[PDB]
Amino acid sequence: QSLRPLVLTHGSLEFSFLVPTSLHFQAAQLKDSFLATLPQPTEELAQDDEPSSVVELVARYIAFVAHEVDEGDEDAHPTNLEVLKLILNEFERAFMRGNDVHAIAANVAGITAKKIGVVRAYYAGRAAAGRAPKPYDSALFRAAAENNVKIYS
Amino acid sequence: QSLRPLVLTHGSLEFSFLVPTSLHFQAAQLKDSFLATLPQPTEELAQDDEPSSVVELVARYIAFVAHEVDEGDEDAH
Amino acid sequence: QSLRPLVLTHGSLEFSFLVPTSLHFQAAQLKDSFLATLPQPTEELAQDDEPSSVVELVARYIAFVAHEVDEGDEDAH
Amino acid sequence: YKPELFDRDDNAVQFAVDWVKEHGPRLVKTSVGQTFVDTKMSRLLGVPPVMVAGMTPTTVPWDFVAATMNAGYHIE
Numbered sequence: 341q342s343l344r345p346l347v348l349t350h351g352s353l354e355f356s357f358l359v360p361t362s363l364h365f366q367a368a369q370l371k372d373s374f375l376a377t378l379p380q381p382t383e384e385l386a387q388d389d390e391p392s393s394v395v396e397l398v399a400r401y402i403a404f405v406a407h408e409v410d411e412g413d414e415d416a417h418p419t420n421l422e423v424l425k426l427i428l429n430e431f432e433r434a435f436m437r438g439n440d441v442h443a444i445a446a447n448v449a450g451i452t453a454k455k456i457g458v459v460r461a462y463y464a465g466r467a468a469a470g471r472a473p474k475p476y477d478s479a480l481f482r483a484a485a486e487n488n489v490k491i492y493s
Numbered sequence: 494q495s496l497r498p499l500v501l502t503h504g505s506l507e508f509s510f511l512v513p514t515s516l517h518f519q520a521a522q523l524k525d526s527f528l529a530t531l532p533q534p535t536e537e538l539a540q541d542d543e544p545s546s547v548v549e550l551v552a553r554y555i556a557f558v559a560h561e562v563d564e565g566d567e568d569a570h
Numbered sequence: 571q572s573l574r575p576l577v578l579t580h581g582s583l584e585f586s587f588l589v590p591t592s593l594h595f596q597a598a599q600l601k602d603s604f605l606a607t608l609p610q611p612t613e614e615l616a617q618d619d620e621p622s623s624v625v626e627l628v629a630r631y632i633a634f635v636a637h638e639v640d641e642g643d644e645d646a647h
Numbered sequence: 648y649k650p651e652l653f654d655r656d657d658n659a660v661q662f663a664v665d666w667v668k669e670h671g672p673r674l675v676k677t678s679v680g681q682t683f684v685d686t687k688m689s690r691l692l693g694v695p696p697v698m699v700a701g702m703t704p705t706t707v708p709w710d711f712v713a714a715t716m717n718a719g720y721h722i723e
Contacts, residue, residue, distance in 0.1 A: 438655065439654070439655040439656055440650070440653040440654065440655055442649055442650035442653045442654075443650040443651075443653065443654040443655065443656070443659070445650070446648075446650040476655065478651075478652055478653045478654050478655060478659065479654050479655060479656065479657065479658075479659035479660050480651065480652055480654065480659065480660050481652075483660055488660075489660060489662075
């Protein structure tokens with residue numbers, strides 16, 4: 341319906357987004373000064389403290405926005421929130437697939453630091469849109485409470 | 494009435510368009526990824542397999558759109 | 571209410587604006603071809619016949635628009 | 648690490664092996680009712696997990712090797 345294509349480009353990796361028409365320029369602003377946050381793009385996957393994959397494009401973006409939601413600019417209060425909720429949706433949608441951020445972050449660039457980077461970026465937009473964690477237990481604690489595993493602390 | 498100016502720019506040639514307000518961003522999208530379809534603009538009229546005039550700006554654009562109408566994307570029918 | 575953030579950027583100086591939603595793209599157009607009116611930005615305050623501060627960003631912009639109001643384009647009165 | 652306490656999906660939990668379990672000796676019988684000790688070795692080879700190792704002087708002659716093989720055992 342009210343839809344406006346948005347791209348996230350860096351080196352070899354880009355992402356496709358579908359914004360409400362109203363919210364398309366609020367998300368253009370972030371996308372813009374956010375690609376300035378990024379350094380000189382490598383067409384490889386090695387620049388340290390910079391995106392390796394497309395799961396990091398969204399992760400690094402989600403946090404970029406949540407910083408300006410919670411902090412500073414009061415001119416764009418409702419617009420930040422909408423921009424957030426959409427990215428958090430597109431994320432839990434494609435990238436997370438209804439699984440935890442950790443097990444999904446655990447599958448990115450071999451660089452240990454970056455995998456943590458994805459996780460803090462999510463719980464940054466998770467809290468900045470007020471979304472509480474939903475009460476799931478893990479496959480571990482299921483089979484734990486079902487006496488397949490015998491967990492100790 | 495419901496009107497929104499749209500430009501088509503390449504090198505020395507550009508075109509002026511008047512869109513309904515509703516349809517102005519659907520035509521902005523095509524205009525955008527279409528000027529990426531175009532190579533590095535010459536300020537002359539010679540780059541082979543690329544626009545010489547403004548009749549070609551519209552021509553090359555009309556086909557760029559009709560490809561995504563008939564084929565692929567069903568989100569924006 | 572009906573509000574859309576607009577920025578005016580040149581070198582070290584930028585300005586923040588709050589447009590009605592309807593009027594946000596009309597002011598985007600001016601902002602755009604107006605930053606083309608400006609030369610290659612100095613990160614200092616000395617380029618002659620070009621903005622030193624943010625009071626000049628608005629001043630130079632106000633006149634840029636008033637030229638297209640009074641003169642020429644009747645499509646966007 | 649951390650992600651294994653929160654992993655949602657199936658077969659997300661792994662169990663550290665037991666050597667007694669994983670690699671424990673066993674017994675099995677055939678359709679023609681032989682009985683083998685069930686080890687990785689015997690199963691691999693297809694014969695009892697007791698084996699006469701290669702030994703130059705004594706394990707060279709083609710007799711003793713063929714004989715020890717006719718006895719259904721692994722020799723080198």
